[PDB]
Design a protein around this ligand. Structure first.
Ligand SMILES: [Zn+2]
Ligand SMILES: [Zn+2]
Length: 250
């Protein structure tokens, strides 16, 4: 069985210093990077991958003023980018969803998790445990009473939807390998590589453990050598130019 439709859904944006996509660059220039969620229409029901930024980021570029990351992260989020609004426009309410998949619990990926109080939220144990104590993590991304479906390592969500454990960018980061009806094998690196250059050329980028992130890239390259998928990266301004986005699908 294959996934019926894979949708790339813009979920607002976020400014990061350009050293975030290339650690060798000298800090001083911000990049307006895309924030994504993905919607998978499957035989078993719709599945949402990531949930955008938290309510606190709405019309609040200075969210991280007063913190250890002041001026280094500026969310670009409007009321329209709240995940429930995104879903409502697409044609879903939170309780319609079969699963939420959290690639990781960074604020640009799990900020909307609180909206889903019934749907199982699939997240790596190592990411969940990290989010409990590491300072990067926002409280909005680790709410205690959500219906977490905690997994460890690789995992098949439904036929055609595979999670690949790719730690490094964050302690329990996971990527997706999807088989779609229209396109066949698709690799969503999520933040296992922000840009094509991080993947192909192994250019270092923002992450908790760069060494581990490299090994996760090498692991993904082995998958690619075997499966020859089309590959989409996490925060790639260049690639975004040519991405088929909602209402188009792959
Ligand atoms: Zn991240
Ligand atoms: Zn990210």
């Amino acid at each position: 069985m294959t996934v019926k439709k894979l949708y790339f859904i813009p979920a607002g944006r976020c400014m990061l210093d350009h050293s975030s996509v290339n650690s060798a660059l000298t800090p001083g220039k911000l990049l307006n990077l895309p924030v994504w969620c993905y919607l998978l229409e499957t035989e078993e029901g719709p599945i949402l991958v990531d949930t955008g930024m938290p309510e606190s980021a709405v019309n609040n570029e200075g969210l991280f003023n007063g913190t250890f990351v002041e001026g280094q992260i500026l969310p670009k989020m409007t009321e329209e980018d709240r995940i429930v609004n995104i879903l409502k426009r697409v044609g879903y309410e939170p309780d319609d969803l079969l699963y939420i998949i959290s690639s990781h619990l960074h604020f640009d990926h799990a900020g909307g998790n609180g909206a889903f109080t019934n749907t199982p939220i699939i997240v790596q144990r190592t990411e969940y445990e990290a989010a409990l104590h590491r300072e990067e993590y926002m409280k909005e991304c680790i709410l205690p009473h959500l219906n977490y479906k905690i997994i460890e390592g690789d995992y098949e969500v439904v036929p055609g939807v595979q999670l690949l454990y790719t730690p490094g960018h964050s302690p329990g980061h996971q990527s997706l390998f999807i088989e779609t009806e229209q396109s066949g094998s698709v690799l969503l690196t999520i933040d296992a590589s922000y840009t094509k250059e991080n993947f192909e050329d192994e250019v270092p980028f923002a992450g908790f453990d760069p060494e581990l992130a490299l090994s996760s890239i090498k692991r993904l390259k082995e998958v690619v050598k075997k499966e020859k998928p089309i590959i989409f990266f996490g925060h790639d301004i260049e690639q975004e130019k040519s991405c088929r986005v909602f209402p188009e699908y792959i």
